[PDB]
Each structure stands twice: as structure tokens, then as C-alpha cells.
């Protein structure tokens, strides 16, 4: 049959969407892109002809862009996450490129041909690429030294042919001059598709990846960096740090949460409880990589491209908070409050609606109009027959992807708490971390 | 030390990296950029010839960009920080150009030459710049005035010469139309390097700065805004609000922190503690400017470009949290938890590894493979012999800067706390503040 599915748990005001397929970035592959430069002398014939003034205008554009580039090289729960340097890998290769001949090694590997693999001084085997040959175009087609010195140019089609080639370089040095020598996502200027697919294919990766990457090439651009590196001899060199999708096609699910309160009629005197583990969950070698800020993940179809360094790694048993939030093994996380406030949280196949107090909560559709008015509490609505959900004054258009949703009838857990001794302010604490503060407040009841 | 250095404190599971050199943005200098406009009536000899069809397109393209601009003007711990208006100065200047003769005063100041200072009506002395002279191109050389305003064009090179001159205005109004009249960083279109280097050099700043700014021109771009301002008489004017680097070259350090836990074997029953005072620190006048989100800041070599308005200013005695977290003078900030979850925090010269529970923590090198397997608790690893570090499923590439790291041995402080009375939930509280809640609960543990 078809693909992705979802279920709502009435008991904990949450839903998970399963049936997705991972695409985790685990490692970084560095590759070196080079552009060959003419290092000309600005005394090419000092003439004033109609189109010689246009070429000389274009050399300027170029000669400045080389120096502009030279001057550039000068010497809930996401808080649990821990931090890294992102492009250390790339820069480290870029830093190795500054040793003595490492650059010429690349010049030489690449004069016979356009692609090459090369071993740097520290052994790392790195893919290199010559994508523009401005040295050859300028030195053997714009210094006409038979006819006649670049003082008097003949055709216009040679003015254009040039500002076409040079255009790429101007758009490159522009992107760097803005972004302090490091760009993401990687534009079509740093790497054209023809180049990026070629590069995908010559990488030290498996076919499982080479397919993933090539079909979702527009994502590969977003998870890559382009680090402007060095420009000495007649070479411009920037490093492109592509991602290594080391785990692929494992199951992924996406956990939705909204707050769950008592529905008492008093203006105050309501208790709230909200599952805090919102986010993505991929299976990753007998443990689950959990991606708490679930926006960073970009999905395409069912494929969930995440970046592992935005993850915790958790026991497989985290998955139990969805089925039995009270179970013994894992200790599911929540956050308490007295702030009974209405909202909806839209799921992959539906919507969750947290409707409280005097707030007005409906579910409308394109044709039948309003087709449900929610009663106070945490409820759910499939995207089958509903297009919008409105809570208060905010309209939510619901997601119109295809798939089966299952309503898991259950007693909301916020009912099991005695509100007189329920810890109203606890901003990331757990199930068990709350059950202790209750075992306590009952002991703190020492009578006469 | 002789350049850059780091020390890891085993006792507070944190590290500071010192030897960096400040460059703070303290103030804003406003400067006026103009482009001169011809304000034509749409009859270029409005006939149907080959190259006349192209010019009329570019005149059209231009006349729109001017109207388009016209229509634009119409009828942890970052939470302590405090908030301001960014472009109040630039906007306030912009508002002053709308007073009566202020524009003609600039116009008049700029027909003899392309730069001049001018005193606006309120005494503020402003640097001005005419960077494109389209009035002059169009009035002399595109409507030739002997024969006959150009009726049916001769050469093609005048079309190109034109859409070259004209690109700049288009690519400028493109940027503004998208970013609603305020862009940052200041692109190569708003101000070319040749210009931004000029403007630095003529600013009312010191040589200490003219040098800093001139070398790190790509960081000055990121710390400037560009405000589209006015378009009256035949003048286009935008204010480029460049930064003023008012403390420069003072020492900076960077405090890295990670969570520090008990390593008991039980699945729950561990206490954690984390230094929250993480982020950059430059000292600037007997006080330490503290930058809690370490990305307001950009680095270049040792130079740490920060923006003082993403800063607290704290007494010098703040550095004691690094030396002796319990001292009386200053009251170091922490955050408690029961959530012992494994992670790394990569530093400037090393890696911190917070490894707990059943989590698998190694440190590899590029060639020898794995060279350390961490035991549960908070440890550190120099970047000397280490290239990657893995915690759970997440791979970290470590920074490859050269510098000396010092591992400062100590009993981790979380070993000193009696966990049956330790506040597991405190989302930003202090050292002394926790020791309060304990000194108390330990008192309520009294007899009869």
C-alpha cells in the first residue's frame, strides 16, 4: 500500500507520525574546488576604441575581484544539546593547503585534467576540481599579440564571450565578500549541478548514498558549506565541505505535543502538563537519535534529512513515552504549569487542539463550513475532512498530506494529579522528578 | 601565552580560551550614499528599430526601478540582555535629509567632486558619496544633443555600456524591495570595496581603527546596515550606518561549559550542575563586557568582533567563576538538573566531553584511529593529537588552531552535594542561591 501514518494519544495530548525514512548527516567530506587565474599586467594597450573601452572595463571588474578576494585572506529541549565547530573539517583541509607545495600539487594534478583525487601532506585523500579556466581564456584569447595588442578590438561577440566567463568569478567573490569567506547553503555558482552530481559520484561513499544525494541534490546544497580558502600562484581555491549521509533509510517518527489541562470552571485553579520531548526520532544502531528542535530537519517526501550534531542519543526505550508514559524503564519528560492557554499544534496528518477556558475552538472545512466545535480539553482531528482548525482568533490551515490517523482513546493523565500538591512551576522536569516532589509534600504533612 | 591558549577546569566542567583581542562595536557612524538620477519623460525616439528596441527596454527597466523606490517611501543567559533600536541613528539622519534644503545642500556639495563632509542642520557632520552618476550618463551620451536626442541608434556597444551602468541601480532597488528598505550586511552593490575603503579612511575615527576596519573589511560589512532613505530633486540617497569600533585590542576569553554529573549506576538518581555563564568576555574599562550568545560575535585570527549591545557589563571579579567558583566576592551562575545526558562542547583548542550512563565516548585521530575511551564524567581532550571526538552517535570534528591547553585537575563540585536535598530544578539560579535552599532544607531536618 501507501506510505506514512499517524496516531494521537488522548492521554498525553500528543501524536506521533511514523513511516518516515531517515537521512542523517554523520560526517563531512571535504573536497577542493579550484579556478585558474590569469595574473595579468595592467599595461595591456592603453587604447580608446568603442569596445576596447568595454573590455578594459571588464578587466577591471576581474582584476579587482582577484584583489577583493586576496584582501579576504588575512591572518523546548534544544538547550541540552552541546555544541561543535561546524566547519572545522573543511578549514583544517583549507589550513593544510597553505603548506608549501600542497597547492602546486593540485595545480599539477590538474593541468592535464579537470578532476583528480590527491593526497595532502597529512594523508587525507581529497577530491579536486578545476571549474573555470580564466588563465587560459585571458592569456590565449584576449591578448591578441598578432592582431593587434588589445588596442583596437574587432568583434563584439568577444566582449560578451568574456563577460560571460568572468561573470561566474564576479558572482563568487561577491558571495564571499558578503559572507566572510564562508557560505551555506552552497549556491549554483560555487558548484553547478553538473559539477555537484559529478562530485557526488566520485566521492568515497556507497551507492545507497549516491542515489539519496543525487535525487535530493537541492538538500545537499543546504547541508554544505563553501569555505573560501586560498589564492596564491595562479589558483583560486575554495573548499566545499559536503555532507556524508552515513545512516539512511532507518525508521523515523515525529512527536507532536500540546499542553493538557484540567478543565475546571474557576478562572484559576487549573493544572497543566505538557510533553516536552517534541521532535524527530530516527532509529540509529540500537539507539534513537532525537532531534529536539524539529525545524532544523528538512524533509523531502518521507526522507527526513537531519544533522546528527543537533541530536541527543537515547535508549531505544524512549519510544515508551508514547505508548505508556508512566512505564518503569524510561522516565518521560514534561513541564508543569497553571497557565491553561488555548492553542493548536498541527500534526503530519491532522491537528491537535488544546481548547481551554472561554476560548472558542472549531474545525472548519472548504465546503461544509464549520463541522466541529471542540469542548474544553485536549482533542484531535484528522485532516481527512477538515481543512482548517481555528482556536481563538488564529486560523490554522491543516496539512493536506495523505495517510491514516488513529485516535487512541485514553484518560488524560492530568486527571491523576491531586491539584493541591501538584508542582505548578517545573520548567523541564520529568514524570518521576515530579512524582518525588509529591512523595515529599505528603511527608511534609507531619501533623500534631 | 605567546598567542592563543586554553585551560580546562575539571572541577566545573568548563574551559576558557584566552589570547584573543577585542574589537567591539560601541557606536554608529552614519554616512550618506547618493546616486544621481535623470528624471526623463518616456519618448526616446519611440520608433521600432533593432537596437532602439533594446535601449527602450533598459530605459524602461530604469524608470521602473526609480518609481519602485519612490513607492517604497509612502502614505543560555541572553535573556538578561536588554534591547535597543539598531538603526535609530541612521534613521534619524535619514529623517533630517527630508528637511528643506538639506538635499540640495548635498547636491550642491557634490557637483565639483564625489566625496565631501557636510554639516546637516542639526550640526551632525556627515560623510557623503556619489557612487553612480546616471544623470550625467543619460543626459550627455544617451540623449545626444546635437543630432538628435538619439532617434535610431548606431552602435550596440552603447546598449551594453548602458545596461552595465544601469545594473547597479537595479541590483540596489532589488535588495531594498526585498528587505523593506533596510539591508544588512552591506553588499558589494550598496558599497563597493573601493568605496568602503575610502569611507573608512575619511571617517572621523582613529588610525587604530582605520587599520582594523581596512583589513577586516568583510566583517565591517556584516556590522553595518544600509538604509534606503530619500529620493527627491534628482537625487537618490541611502544612509550607510557603519560601525564605530570604540574598544579595540583589549583581551578576550571564551567560556565554554558543559553539564557536570554524578556517575551513579542507577538509571535515575544522578544530579547535574552546569555553568551558565558561558559566552565571550572582553574587558573594556575595569569591567568585563560579557557576550552571552557567542554568535553575535564573529572571529578573525585572535580578533573577536562583538557588538556591545548584545552585552552585559559585569565587574572584573567575574573571572573568579573560572578560578574558584565558590569565592565570596562574585556569585557564579549555574543551572541544576537531574538530566544526565551525554554530549560534547567543542572548544577553541580542545573538546569537552560529558559522557554519562551507558553512552559510548571515544576520541579518534585521523591516522592512529581511536586513542581514548572516556569514563563516565566530565573530561577534556587537547586538540594536539586528536581530530575527531564521538559522543553517542554524534561525530565532532575538533578545531585545528595551534595553542597550549592546560588541564586543571580538581574534584568536580557536584561530588560535594548531598543529593537527597539538592535542588534538581533551578533553570538559572546561582551558587549561593542553591546553597541557600540547601542550608535551609538541611535545617528543617530537625528533631524533638
Amino acid at each position, epitope marked *: 500500500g501507501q506510505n506514512i501514518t499517524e496516531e494521537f494519544y488522548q492521554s498525553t495530548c500528543s501524536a506521533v507520525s511514523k513511516g518516515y525514512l531517515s537521512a542523517l548527516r554523520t*560526517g563531512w567530506y571535504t573536497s577542493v574546488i579550484t579556478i585558474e587565474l590569469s595574473n595579468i599586467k595592467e599595461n595591456k594597450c592603453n587604447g580608446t576604441d568603442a569596445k576596447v573601452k568595454l573590455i578594459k572595463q571588464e578587466l577591471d571588474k576581474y582584476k579587482n575581484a582577484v584583489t577583493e578576494l586576496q584582501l579576504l585572506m588575512q591572518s523546548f529541549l534544544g538547550f541540552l544539546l552541546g555544541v561543535g565547530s561546524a566547519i572545522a*573539517s573543511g578549514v583544517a583541509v583549507c589550513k593544510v593547503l597553505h603548506l608549501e607545495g600542497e597547492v602546486n600539487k593540485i595545480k599539477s594534478a590538474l593541468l592535464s585534467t579537470n578532476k583528480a583525487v590527491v593526497s595532502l601532506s597529512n594523508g587525507v*585523500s581529497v577530491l579536486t576540481f578545476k571549474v573555470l579556466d580564466l588563465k587560459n581564456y585571458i592569456d590565449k584569447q584576449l591578448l591578441p599579440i598578432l592582431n593587434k595588442q588589445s588596442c583596437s578590438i574587432s568583434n563584439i561577440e568577444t566582449v560578451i564571450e568574456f563577460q560571460q566567463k568572468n561573470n561566474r568569478l564576479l558572482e563568487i567573490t561577491r558571495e564571499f565578500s558578503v559572507n566572510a569567506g564562508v557560505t551555506t547553503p552552497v549556491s549554483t555558482y560555487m558548484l553547478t549541478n553538473s559539477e555537484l552530481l559529478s562530485l557526488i*559520484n566520485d566521492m568515497p561513499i*556507497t551507492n545507497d548514498q549516491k542515489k539519496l544525494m543525487s535525487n535530493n541534490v537541492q538538500i545537499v546544497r543546504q547541508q554544505s558549506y563553501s569555505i573560501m580558502c586560498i589564492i596564491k600562484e595562479e589558483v583560486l581555491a575554495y573548499v566545499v565541505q559536503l555532507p*556524508l549521509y552515513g545512516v539512511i*533509510d532507518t525508521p523515523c517518527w515525529k512527536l507532536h505535543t500540546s499542553p493538557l489541562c484540567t478543565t475546571n470552571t474557576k478562572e484559576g485553579s487549573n493544572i497543566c502538563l505538557t510533553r516536552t520531548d517534541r521532535g524527530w526520532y530516527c532509529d540509529n544502531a*540500537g539507539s534513537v537519535s532525537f532531534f529536539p528542535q524539529a525545524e532544523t530537519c528538512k524533509v523531502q517526501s518521507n526522507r527526513v534529512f537531519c544533522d546528527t550534531m543537533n541530536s541527543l542519543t537515547l535508549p531505544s526505550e524512549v519510544n515508551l513515552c508514547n505508548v505508556d508514559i508512566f512505564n518503569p524503564k524510561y522516565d518521560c519528560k514534561i513541564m508543569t504549569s497553571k497557565t491553561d492557554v488555548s492553542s493548536s499544534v498541527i500534526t503530519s496528518l491532522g491537528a491537535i487542539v488544546s481548547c481551554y477556558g472561554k476560548t472558542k475552538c472549531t474545525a472548519s472545512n472548504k465546503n461544509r463550513g464549520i463541522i466541529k466545535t471542540f469542548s474544553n480539553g485536549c482533542d484531535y482531528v484528522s485532516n481527512k475532512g477538515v481543512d482548517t482548525v481555528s482556536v481563538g482568533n488564529t486560523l490554522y490551515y491543516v496539512n493536506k498530506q495523505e495517510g491514516k490517523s488513529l485516535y487512541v482513546k485514553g484518560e488524560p493523565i492530568i486527571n491523576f494529579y491531586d491539584p493541591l500538591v501538584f508542582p505548578s512551576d517545573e520548567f523541564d522536569a520529568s514524570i518521576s522528578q515530579v512524582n518525588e516532589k509529591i512523595n515529599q509534600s505528603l511527608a511534609f504533612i507531619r501533623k500534631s | 601565552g605567546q598567542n592563543i591558549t586554553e585551560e580546562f577546569y575539571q572541577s566545573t566542567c568548563s574551559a576558557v580560551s584566552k589570547g584573543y583581542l577585542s574589537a567591539l562595536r560601541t557606536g554608529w557612524y552614519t554616512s550618506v550614499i547618493t546616486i544621481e538620477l535623470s528624471n526623463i519623460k518616456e519618448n526616446k525616439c519611440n520608433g521600432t528599430d533593432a537596437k532602439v528596441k533594446l535601449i527602450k527596454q533598459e530605459l524602461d527597466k530604469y524608470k521602473n526601478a526609480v518609481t519602485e523606490l519612490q513607492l517604497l517611501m509612502q502614505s543560555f543567559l541572553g535573556f538578561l540582555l536588554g534591547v535597543g533600536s539598531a538603526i535609530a541613528s541612521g534613521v534619524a539622519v535619514c529623517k533630517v535629509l527630508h528637511l528643506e534644503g538639506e538635499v540640495n545642500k548635498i547636491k550642491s556639495a557634490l557637483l565639483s567632486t564625489n566625496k565631501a563632509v557636510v554639516s546637516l542642520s542639526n550640526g551632525v557632520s556627515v560623510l557623503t558619496f556619489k557612487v553612480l552618476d546616471l544623470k550625467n550618463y543619460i543626459d550627455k551620451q544617451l540623449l545626444p544633443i546635437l543630432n538628435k536626442q538619439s532617434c535610431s541608434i548606431s552602435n550596440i556597444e552603447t546598449v551594453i555600456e548602458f545596461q552595465q551602468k544601469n545594473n547597479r541601480l537595479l541590483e540596489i532597488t532589488r535588495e531594498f524591495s526585498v528587505n523593506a528598505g533596510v539591508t544588512t550586511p552591506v553588499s558589494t552593490y550598496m558599497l563597493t570595496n573601493s568605496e568602503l575603503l575610502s569611507l573608512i579612511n575619511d571617517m572621523p575615527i582613529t588610525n587604530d581603527q582605520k587599520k582594523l576596519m581596512s583589513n577586516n573589511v568583510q566583517i565591517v560589512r556584516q556590522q553595518s546596515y544600509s538604509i534606503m532613505c530619500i529620493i527627491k530633486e534628482e537625487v537618490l540617497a541611502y544612509v550607510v550606518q557603519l560601525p564605530l569600533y570604540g574598544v579595540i585590542d583589549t583581551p578576550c576569553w571564551k567560556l565554554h561549559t558543559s553539564p557536570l554529573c554524578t556517575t551513579n549506576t542507577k538509571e535515575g538518581s544522578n544530579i547535574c550542575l552546569t555553568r551558565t555563564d558561558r559566552g565571550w568576555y572582553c574587558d573594556n574599562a575595569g569591567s568585563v563586557s560579557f557576550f552571552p550568545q557567542a554568535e553575535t560575535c564573529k572571529v578573525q585570527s585572535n580578533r573577536v568582533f562583538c557588538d556591545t549591545m548584545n552585552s552585559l557589563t559585569l565587574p572584573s571579579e567575574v573571572n573568579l567563576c573560572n578560578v574558584d567558583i565558590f569565592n565570596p566576592k562574585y556569585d557564579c551562575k549555574i543551572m541544576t538538573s537531574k538530566t544526565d545526558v551525554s554530549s560534547s562542547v567543542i572548544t577553541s583548542l580542545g573538546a569537552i566531553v560529558s559522557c554519562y550512563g551507558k553512552t559510548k565516548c571515544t576520541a579518534s585521530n585521523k591516522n592512529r584511529g581511536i586513542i581514548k575511551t572516556f569514563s563516565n564524567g566530565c573530561d577534556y581532550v587537547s586538540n594536539k593529537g586528536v581530530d575527531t571526538v564521538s559522543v553517542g552517535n554524534t561525530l565532532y570534528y575538533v578545531n585545528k588552531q595551534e595553542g597550549k591547553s592546560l588541564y586543571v585537575k580538581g574534584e568536580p563540585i557536584i561530588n560535594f552535594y548531598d543529593p537527597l536535598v539538592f535542588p534538581s530544578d533551578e533553570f538559572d539560579a546561582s551558587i549561593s542561591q542553591v546553597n541557600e535552599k540547601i542550608n535551609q532544607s538541611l535545617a528543617f531536618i530537625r528533631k524533638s
Partner: single-chain antibody
Amino acid sequence: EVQLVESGGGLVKPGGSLRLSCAASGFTFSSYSMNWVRQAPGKGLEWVSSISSSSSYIYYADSVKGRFTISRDNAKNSLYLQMNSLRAEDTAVYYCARARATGYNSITPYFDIWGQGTLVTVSSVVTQTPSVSGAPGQRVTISCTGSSSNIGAGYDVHWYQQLPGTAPKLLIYDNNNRPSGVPDRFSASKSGTSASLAITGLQAEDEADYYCQSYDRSLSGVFGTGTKVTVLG
């Protein structure tokens, strides 16, 4: 026990069929990519077919294209191989294997878990030094030499120890890292287009066939020709 146990092997007449099944147990199957790698009657180890974790990415060696069909039932914790139109070259021990990848500047699978294999008879490259011998206590080394593609194009190297009757066991992964049960005696290298295994102090248990493994961009995963290390006295 993390374990794989194959089944369905026997004898088959050419132009025939037979459907091998590997059942896995003691780990969550759905998370790893599963493989068939087979071994000829007397020597080499050659990769057959690979299947991704959720069955979206599946690939076959040229040897078996259009004839063999790989498949998996994650719900039944099992992996299948559907062989049709068999030939006399297909006779071999068919191993079932768990694949794994650990990425520093490359992602080249290795096999950390093997079954015992089921034998299937049908009737009616990267070179390494073919033999090494040395005395107990001594040091010996095995050279493993590859090409412009695979190792020289930036992939990694792995090593296996196959005692005479047994299944391959993982000996070295990612050039120089030892698994749980491998003594510090064993140590290995990578260089350019080639590798080297180094055994310090020969034992009774060290007498076995040694295969280096790596991944080639077209051949899609490749073993050495094998090295019989023999211990004297």
C-alpha cells in the same frame, strides 16, 4: 547473543531455483543494512547483494544481476535471497551479514556480524600476498594493494580472520581499530592505494585465512584474495 542463522541451502540442478533466508536475533533488525556475501569452494570472498535498512536502496554484484533477488521482512526479523537460473559458478557458502559504517572523511561499509553460512552447490579486484609464515613469538605482516578506485579514491580498509572451517570474524575496521574481542597484538595501516595487517607474536589461534576488505566505486565493495598465515615450530 547477537546472532544470524541462515537456511534453505542444499543442492540444486542448473537453470533452477532456491531461496535462502537469514534470520537475525538479539538486535533491532530494521536499523542496519543487510548483505549476502559468498565464498567459493576453496578461496575468495565475494560480495553478492546489499539491501538498505528499509529496502529502498538495493544493489547487486555483476555476477548475479537479473538472476538473484534480495528482500527483507523486518517484521519477521529476516533477510531473503531469491536465486533463479543458477549456474555452476554460484556454488559457495552463502553468508548473511550485518553492515556498519563509521565516517571520518568517508563512508565505506564493513561487516561486524556474520552467520555460519548455508552451503549451496549447483551441479548435475584487490590483491594481497597469498601466503605468510612465521614462528611463534615473531612479527609478520600482510600487504593489501588496491587501485585508483576503492582505496586510492579515498575509501577505507577492513580486515577479517577466518579460521579454517569457520565464518569470517571482523578483525580490523576503519584502518586501525580493534573490535571487542581482538587482542592488541593485531594492528593495521592504510597508505595511498594500499594497506597492511601486522600480527605481533604468533599463536595457535592465529593460523587462519586473512582477508582485507574495502569498497570500490563500481564493484561496490571488494575483498582481498586472501592470505593464509601459518605458524611453525
